[PDB]
Design a protein around this ligand. Structure first.
Ligand SMILES: OC[C@H]1O[C@@](CO)(O[C@H]2O[C@H](CO)[C@@H](O)[C@H](O)[C@H]2O)[C@@H](O)[C@@H]1O
Ligand SMILES: *[C@@H]1O[C@H](CO)[C@@H](O)[C@H](O)[C@H]1NC(C)=O
Ligand SMILES: *[C@@H]1O[C@H](CO)[C@@H](O)[C@H](O)[C@H]1NC(C)=O
Ligand SMILES: *[C@@H]1O[C@H](CO)[C@@H](O)[C@H](O)[C@H]1NC(C)=O
Length: 537
């Protein structure tokens, strides 16, 4: 009755969904809460719906845990997070709205401490632990989204909240004696002028040279080398920006790396439809999982008709790149279990100027794509014009049918029978200069013809990929009907989007490997795997 729902991602079986809340692991069992509306498909009566997992793919439902049932949140149960106590106990810090509509911070512990499901959450009476008042003085309507809490070189527990002072975005921190009495720190971990409110802030360390993530309370180790990443969801831009740096424990301030603010030149986790993103430390695999919400690119009139709004992007694994100034993301390996026992392959195939070879035997609407493009003679690449600095902007000013020396060439997913409607993520190579052997790799995700219904978020997203076009260029594509996640250079580039085709659905879907550019490129290899369904609820 509806071909726009995902088969292996995650979403409620009905109604609106928002921010990802309190992601963690306890007794080998992962947990996921989130902003959910039990009444309709439009933001409302938000509650902390629950679900659990053993492979971050299959989810078992559970009745809402944090919902309005006390003064301190009688008007709403906003986003929060869960900290792992130095004994294995998992609590929660969430923003509730009290009887006089003002963002207060409340804490919540579990009931049956032995229950591996933690379905019943107990909410302290001392709540709220933190609230905007006459002394702290802050926009009571702009003090929410508390992060996970990290100890320190002492007993002092630290955490930050997202606020704003006259357009001055920041992260208010509160030191805690023993996770009960919280003192309002007289200085934000950081802040940035210009950018509005700071939402869904997240603060966590990353080892420099290591794939597996680091704990949340790790401090100055003489053997291991740590770095820090503060990410915050912006308001007036609806994107996610992070930044890497150091953390002077003295002034409890965050110091980004060599000239890098949180807005202006700040990198995005995802250069497409991403939001409310948040991480969490996996004790079991020693990795850091990254959750992201991702709006609904369909008109609301649709969310009301289809009965649902909001999907959750596949948990990603992030970590610092070798260069040290960019996070590397790549979906959880355990998801490749939904891959059909079969295997669609294609190796050593030429892509003549403006050619395209179809990928046949595969659920074109629910698969895992993956290509390795090879570019010969990089010299044929064009030299970028000055102005072209914003990735997104270039991909929007130069659609798919506009040729380039090296490009455009990538994938066409959920493509229609004869291309009346298709999606096209691809690459374009240019020279940074002319003789200073340095190239720029453009990753574009065109949405202009993603569907036939003019009423959809057709905005195209753009991004740059820090890879060396000397070797082959990678590009993966998770395919799941309405949602498509793009990955370039092994995650180095993550552009996700939402499509709603009228002809490209179910068994009527097609895939396509193209190259409509001048110079012809080669397909060193390409594997498309059909993807079975995941038990979501
Ligand atoms: O409880 C809502 C929950 O969502 C967030 C996500 O960033 O709120 C933002 O998005 C809303 C929908 O566009 C806006 O109305 C709201 O003003 C904005 O902050 C979280 O901040 C919040 O916890
Ligand atoms: C509730 O928690 C208690 C912890 O003492 C546990 O003994 C009990 O099994 C739980 N409830 C049940 C029976 O599921
Ligand atoms: C800040 O607070 C004032 C009064 O509480 C409110 O009118 C204003 O909208 C707030 N600014 C925003 C949008 O964060
Ligand atoms: C959020 O989703 C809406 C549709 O509900 C879309 O139009 C918009 O581009 C997305 N982000 C914003 C507010 O720009």
């Amino acid at each position: 009755n509806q071909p726009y729902r995902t088969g292996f991602h995650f979403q409620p079986p009905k109604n609106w969904m928002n921010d990802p809340n309190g992601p963690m692991i306890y007794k080998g069992i992962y947990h996921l809460f989130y902003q959910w509306n039990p009444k309709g498909a439009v933001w409302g009566n938000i509650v902390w719906a629950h679900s659990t997992s053993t492979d971050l793919i299959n989810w078992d439902p559970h009745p809402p845990a944090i919902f309005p049932s006390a003064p301190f949140d009688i008007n709403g149960c906003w986003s929060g997070s869960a900290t792992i106590l130095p004994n294995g106990k998992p609590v929660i810090l969430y923003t509730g709205i009290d009887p006089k509509n003002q963002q207060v911070q409340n804490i919540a512990e579990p009931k049956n401490l032995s229950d591996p499901y933690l379905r019943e959450w107990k909410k302290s009476p001392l709540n709220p632990l933190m609230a905007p008042d006459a002394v702290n003085g802050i926009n009571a309507s702009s003090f929410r989204d508390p992060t996970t809490a990290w100890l320190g070189q002492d007993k002092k527990w630290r955490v930050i909240i997202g606020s704003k002072i006259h357009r001055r975005g920041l992260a208010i921190t509160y030191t805690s004696k023993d996770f009960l009495k919280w003192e309002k720190s007289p200085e934000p971990l950081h802040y940035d002028d210009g950018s509005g409110m700071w939402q869904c802030p997240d603060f966590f360390p990353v080892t420099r040279f290591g794939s597996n993530g680091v704990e949340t309370s790790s401090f100055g180790e003489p053997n291991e080398i740590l770095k820090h990443v503060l990410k915050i969801s912006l308001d007036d831009t609806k994107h996610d920006y992070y930044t890497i740096g150091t953390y002077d424990r003295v002034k409890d301030k965050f110091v980004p790396d060599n000239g890098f603010k949180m807005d202006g030149t700040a990198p995005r986790y995802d250069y497409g439809k991403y939001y409310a993103s948040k991480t969490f430390f996996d004790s079991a695999k020693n990795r850091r999982i990254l959750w992201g919400w991702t709006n609904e690119s369909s008109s609301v009139e649709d969310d009301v008709e289809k009965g649902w709004s909001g999907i959750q992007t596949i948990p990603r694994k992030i970590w610092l790149d070798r260069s040290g100034k960019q996070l590397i993301q790549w979906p959880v390996r355990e998801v490749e279990r939904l891959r059909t026992k079969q295997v669609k392959n294609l190796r050593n195939k030429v892509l003549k100027s403006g050619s395209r070879l179809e990928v046949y035997g595969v659920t074109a609407a629910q698969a895992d794509v993956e290509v390795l493009f090879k570019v010969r003679d990089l010299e044929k690449a064009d030299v970028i014009e000055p102005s072209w600095t914003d990735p997104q902007l270039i991909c929007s000013k130069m659609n798919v049918s506009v040729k380039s020396g090296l490009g455009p060439f990538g994938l066409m997913v959920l493509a229609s029978k004869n291309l009346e409607e298709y999606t096209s993520v691809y690459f374009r190579i240019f020279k940074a200069r002319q003789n200073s052997n340095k190239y720029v790799v453009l990753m574009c995700s065109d949405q202009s013809r993603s569907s036939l219904k003019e009423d959809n978020d057709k905005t195209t997203y753009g991004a740059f990929v820090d890879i060396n076009p000397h070797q082959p260029l990678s590009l993966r594509a998770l395919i799941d009907h309405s949602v498509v996640e793009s990955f370039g250079g092994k995650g180095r580039a993550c552009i996700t989007s939402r499509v709603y085709p009228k002809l490209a659905i179910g068994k009527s879907s097609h895939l396509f490997a193209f190259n409509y550019g001048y110079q012809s490129v080669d397909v060193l290899n390409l594997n498309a795997w059909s993807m079975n369904s995941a038990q979501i609820s």
